[PDB]
Amino acid sequence: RVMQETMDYHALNAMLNLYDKAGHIQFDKDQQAIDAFFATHVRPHSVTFASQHERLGTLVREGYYDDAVLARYDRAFVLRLFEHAHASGFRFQTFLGAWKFYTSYTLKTFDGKRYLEHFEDRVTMVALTLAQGDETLATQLTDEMLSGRFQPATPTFLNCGKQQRGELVSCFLLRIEDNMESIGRAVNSALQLSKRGGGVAFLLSNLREAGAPIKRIENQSSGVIPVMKMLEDAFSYANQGAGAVYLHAHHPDILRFLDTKRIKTLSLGVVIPDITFRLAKENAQMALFSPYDIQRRYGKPFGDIAISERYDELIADPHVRKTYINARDFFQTLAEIQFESGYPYIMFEDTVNRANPIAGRINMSNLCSEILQVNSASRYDDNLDYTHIGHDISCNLGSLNIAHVMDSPDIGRTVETAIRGLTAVSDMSHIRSVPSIAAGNAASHAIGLGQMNLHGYLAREGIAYGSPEALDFTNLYFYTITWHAVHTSMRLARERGKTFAGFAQSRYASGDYFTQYLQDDWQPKTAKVRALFARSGITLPTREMWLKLRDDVMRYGIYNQNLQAVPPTGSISYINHATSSIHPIVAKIEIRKEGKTGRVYYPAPFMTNENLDMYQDAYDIGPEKIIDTYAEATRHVDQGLSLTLFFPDTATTRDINKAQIYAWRKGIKSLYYIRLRQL
Amino acid sequence: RVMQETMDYHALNAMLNLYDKAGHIQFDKDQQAIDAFFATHVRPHSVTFASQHERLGTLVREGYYDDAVLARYDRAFVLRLFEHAHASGFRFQTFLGAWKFYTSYTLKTFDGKRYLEHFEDRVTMVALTLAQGDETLATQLTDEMLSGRFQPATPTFLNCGKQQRGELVSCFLLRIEDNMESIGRAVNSALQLSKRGGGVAFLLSNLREAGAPIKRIENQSSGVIPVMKMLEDAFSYANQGAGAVYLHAHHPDILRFLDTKRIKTLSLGVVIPDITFRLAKENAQMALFSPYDIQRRYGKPFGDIAISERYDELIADPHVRKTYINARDFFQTLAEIQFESGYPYIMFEDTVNRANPIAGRINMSNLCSEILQVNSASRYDDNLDYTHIGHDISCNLGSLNIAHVMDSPDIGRTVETAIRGLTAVSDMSHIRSVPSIAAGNAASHAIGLGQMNLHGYLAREGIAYGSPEALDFTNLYFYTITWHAVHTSMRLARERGKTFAGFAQSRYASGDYFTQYLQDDWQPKTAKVRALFARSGITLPTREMWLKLRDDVMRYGIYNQNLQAVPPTGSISYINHATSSIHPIVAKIEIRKEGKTGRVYYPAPFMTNENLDMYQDAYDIGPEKIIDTYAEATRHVDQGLSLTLFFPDTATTRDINKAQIYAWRKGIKSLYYIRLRQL
Numbered sequence A, B: 001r002v003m004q005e006t007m008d009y010h011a012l013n014a015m016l017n018l019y020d021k022a023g024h025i026q027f028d029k030d031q032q033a034i035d036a037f038f039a040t041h042v043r044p045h046s047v048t049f050a051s052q053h054e055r056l057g058t059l060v061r062e063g064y065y066d067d068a069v070l071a072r073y074d075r076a077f078v079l080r081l082f083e084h085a086h087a088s089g090f091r092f093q094t095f096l097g098a099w100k101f102y103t104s105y106t107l108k109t110f111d112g113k114r115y116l117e118h119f120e121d122r123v124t125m126v127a128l129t130l131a132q133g134d135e136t137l138a139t140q141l142t143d144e145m146l147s148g149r150f151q152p153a154t155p156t157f158l159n160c161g162k163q164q165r166g167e168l169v170s171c172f173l174l175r176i177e178d179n180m181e182s183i184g185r186a187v188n189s190a191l192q193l194s195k196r197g198g199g200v201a202f203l204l205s206n207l208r209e210a211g212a213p214i215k216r217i218e219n220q221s222s223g224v225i226p227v228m229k230m231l232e233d234a235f236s237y238a239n240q241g242a243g244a245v246y247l248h249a250h251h252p253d254i255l256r257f258l259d260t261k262r263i264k265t266l267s268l269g270v271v272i273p274d275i276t277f278r279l280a281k282e283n284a285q286m287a288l289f290s291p292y293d294i295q296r297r298y299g300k301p302f303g304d305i306a307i308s309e310r311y312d313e314l315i316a317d318p319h320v321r322k323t324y325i326n327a328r329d330f331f332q333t334l335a336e337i338q339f340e341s342g343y344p345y346i347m348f349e350d351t352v353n354r355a356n357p358i359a360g361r362i363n364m365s366n367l368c369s370e371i372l373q374v375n376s377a378s379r380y381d382d383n384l385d386y387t388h389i390g391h392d393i394s395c396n397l398g399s400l401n402i403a404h405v406m407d408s409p410d411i412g413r414t415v416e417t418a419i420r421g422l423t424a425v426s427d428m429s430h431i432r433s434v435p436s437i438a439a440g441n442a443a444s445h446a447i448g449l450g451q452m453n454l455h456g457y458l459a460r461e462g463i464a465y466g467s468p469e470a471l472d473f474t475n476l477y478f479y480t481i482t483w484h485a486v487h488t489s490m491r492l493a494r495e496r497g498k499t500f501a502g503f504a505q506s507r508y509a510s511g512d513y514f515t516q517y518l519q520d521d522w523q524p525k526t527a528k529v530r531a532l533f534a535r536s537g538i539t540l541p542t543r544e545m546w547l548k549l550r551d552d553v554m555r556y557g558i559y560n561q562n563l564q565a566v567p568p569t570g571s572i573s574y575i576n577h578a579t580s581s582i583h584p585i586v587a588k589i590e591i592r593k594e595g596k597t598g599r600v601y602y603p604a605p606f607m608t609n610e611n612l613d614m615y616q617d618a619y620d621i622g623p624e625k626i627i628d629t630y631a632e633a634t635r636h637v638d639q640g641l642s643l644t645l646f647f648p649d650t651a652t653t654r655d656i657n658k659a660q661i662y663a664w665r666k667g668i669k670s671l672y673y674i675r676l677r678q679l
């Protein structure tokens, strides 16, 4: 109001980092930070036009907005939607969300001096982009985004509608075959993807080990390390461009591989089948097989056969060279490297395939260990031309904010919109630099819908993370989300007359995918959990519904080969105002090293001085509770979930190992990095 | 003979490293080394068949000889040629030649225990391979090789005719364009070429400098170093696979570039135009121009415009960003790096283009600085597919042994055979992994005929290296070789009805190429030199001949775009028994660190205790005499000559620089490495 003092937003934000003699925080100060930000910074540097109409005009004229996007609608519908947007009542809930959106997400004039968009403008453009002319779908997307229910991945949210636009997808998984063409391509792909800001993970399990033959002459191959060396250099050059490599635990270079991190910027990931755990239990030895022999004798690559199921067969075939290391020592090295670097990530091959409803095996994952899909080899001509374009994996993501989803009765529309939005991201993608990525996305329409703010919700509702109530909720919540997503995908296939490639061989086709849901235990184990769904008007899918969907799926099929995937939510979290994963908060007042002050503080959603006790941080909760929560969700998520375990700095490799053992026994499909308290 | 002692060939070889109280060597001991080698080793482990016929049979049956080669002739002609071969009277002249041929060049049984070929068998197979069914040409090749007059490059000599065969060409030059596709391809090429043992050189002058824009955003590019880093790693992986990079002296990263060697295994090469020398003379500054601007404003890449001719224009255009360093300090850094590492190589751009008879500019050279040809850009699709296949350079080599050439009157047949042989190497090449190399070789038919044993000859004839007699001879000898090579190429074009691509724009077409030869100074300046040609029956081409060839060339054209190129002769030298280049011997008894004894000693050809004074080593002769000799040859060789300068270990960078200045003023097209005495 008229003449007011104190307008230093950072100072105000910083008050969040103060405790009073009773251990309380002045949460109000953040809000005052917001207000001061808008008054001293946002408003003064934002561009206001005489009307929406003249703005679009100008924005398209000076090369900011892409007229092609706007051209798919009657301009009037366009003006009406922006108006509906700015009428929604949207407010940033935290000083960091606001600042984060203005400093990194919103459109600025090319000289960088002024803003040209506000939150609702960006949402609007995203809705127009994804809706592709479908007015009713564009309004919904708008609504879902403004209400906080849906939040598309950073790369989509940022580029949609812009003239000078990045890619809408930024995370890829490529396989490498055991021949020089496939290697040269991989380095090329790294290069063309990295320059476009993509996260790229590479499978190494098919490469022949150090010492294997080449053209029949003995002891000649160099193994994976030198290829890692090349992929590493490509990622450094093209820059924001990060890499990963996955290697099967029973591959001959496994220890040399792990030893690179004892190569500086590549992330490592290990695939571990069940047999490896059995071996370590009985203090046995691990047999490592040569991909070179496996190819010659079995006619498929290392990364395409099933090690566990053929373990003994392989050890018996004298035509397959075997090498041996100490299983228990393997896990020991693993925990020690993880203790220091956070990775290697771990992908439980047997758990994954056993749960995989798609014909084929899953031999790798991504830079965040949440993506798990099938892939297939590409073959090349000597000039590097593709003679057979296989299928690799690009990964289209977005996430719902659990609290807001529960706060809206029409949960079926909430999910269906998101699925329709991600599906669009897939439909509009054509990654030209790497045909196997373009073929794959086009054949599978695979998408990854995820969740966030679970902790935020459970706290708001007075439930403690990890508790029997919590576990009950996360099981039934993922239960219902799954029902509506599969339904939406079925509708898409029906309204489009096509299904994902190879649907017929899926467990969706035969019906086996539903067995799980046809048995019981979908009755709320807890009384509070029954109360939450009821007070929200959400109906937990009943056996009839599943039985009905089974028939629809079997008859019409589904459009997307994969629907869910739960990554960590990076900085979109601050915008959407959600607690990052489905995992507990890493802190009450998360501190970030950003901006002209050095730090910006972020309070957890729905947290106040009267409910602090519900915000025990991830360290305090510990691994068990976290693993348990993820276990409940893993029973439904058809892909994976980035799972990080937070440990005190006195934890030991045995502690780490015991956690991983528990994760494994519990059904967890994958583990992201193990993190130790250090600030 | 019946019961003889002393059969240790190495011990006998080693006697060459002994001086008697009068400073004389027992050269006879080497011969005894040969004899003992044959008796104790070669004969006992060689496979003898009941007949030639059964041998071919077996060799083709067990997968050693390629029946496709033999199939181009009546088997009888085949048996007759092997017989003519073994009847020639061929003898190894030195213990190293023999051992070198048996341990590294001849065909062995796959288990490595026995030899399956002798010198004449390998020569025969090479003649059959290159002759391609032409019986008369196969006999000649056989004769030329057995007499010592011709010696094909190692890669050809070694693989021809073999079933399990390497490439016949192993040296390539590729250009890189200023875009990510072209970079990815380059790394790919490195990989596919290196695995096949090729030497690959890359042009970097077109890449935009560190700090240049990308997509209009300022300060973004990383320059050449990170690309060097990638090419370096590719060469380490694919292994025997060596690399080089060339950079224009006036490129903005010139000092960062040089600074990598102050990157461990890549060779460096610098292109230096005349202006740079003028600047250093007047202690001026060097202007470095940005390839990014040059492209935008001139529409061609840095490496395609003429810096010297546009120096001032460029400095004046305010649309071209300029950077500045101290010319004299540049040469200083150069000499200091050369002092320690031998390179950078140096290619005198202006000298080269001025002498280039082919339409286009020459912007790079090879790993040995003897190759100088034109090239052109390739353009790519985003999937890396070629949309326009440009022209890169592969390099087909072989060399004549001057002494033996002079020892045969029909010098016209000697040259014509060699040209026909190299041309075949070109005709049979199809490097599939890199289309620009295949296109180029197919469009130009470029070959590189070279010379060796010059010092061996001059010594035999009692002429001192560097002397006025010597200079007279090397000028007229290269004069005549040139006449017959151009003649042969003209005949080829005539008998094949086609010329090199772009002949019409060449100086061969207009006739300007001959002007040089139409004026005088082809009269032997020395009386001995007149005597040598006469005593050999070789007629120095007369103006009539040139005048006649001019008409023939202008009317029928020539087949090959380039004919001569004088590289250093590696180990083929020991086989052919020639003094390596056209440069003086590096030693009287060259010592090599090879074999079970650690060393093998090699005496120079035609050297005895009564003519030692004619074998002053390269150090003793010094740079001037060497440069001078090369100057005489450079006036005729249409490509280049690897020129190494040998210095005492007390030489200074000023000494090095003064040499390079003299080379430059003298016409030298290029300089290989500067070597300092160190053993």
Ligand SMILES: Cc1cn([C@H]2C[C@H](O)[C@@H](COP(=O)(O)OP(=O)(O)OP(=O)(O)O)O2)c(=O)[nH]c1=O
Pocket: A177, A178, A179, A180, A181, A207, A208, A213, A214, A215, A216, A220, A221, A222, A223, B195, B237, B238, B239
């Ligand atoms: C050439 C070469 C290959 N390799 C490895 C890379 C690949 O994993 C593997 C296959 O290379 P490829 O190019 O498939 O080998 P090839 O087909 O020539 O030989 P083969 O017929 O035996 O397969 O060889 C090296 O490690 N170093 C090398 O120098």
Ligand SMILES: Cc1cn([C@H]2C[C@H](O)[C@@H](COP(=O)(O)OP(=O)(O)OP(=O)(O)O)O2)c(=O)[nH]c1=O
Pocket: A195, A237, A238, A239, B177, B178, B179, B180, B181, B207, B208, B213, B214, B215, B216, B220, B221, B222, B223
């Ligand atoms: C992407 C990228 C390019 N480069 C360099 C490599 C090439 O020499 C040069 C050209 O890359 P290009 O892929 O041609 O650049 P572009 O076409 O996207 O941008 P422009 O339109 O400006 O040309 O950019 C880097 O140094 N680092 C990078 O991350």
Ligand SMILES: [Mg+2]
Pocket: A178, A179, A180
């Ligand atoms: Mg192979």
Ligand SMILES: [Mg+2]
Pocket: B178, B179, B180
């Ligand atoms: Mg470009």
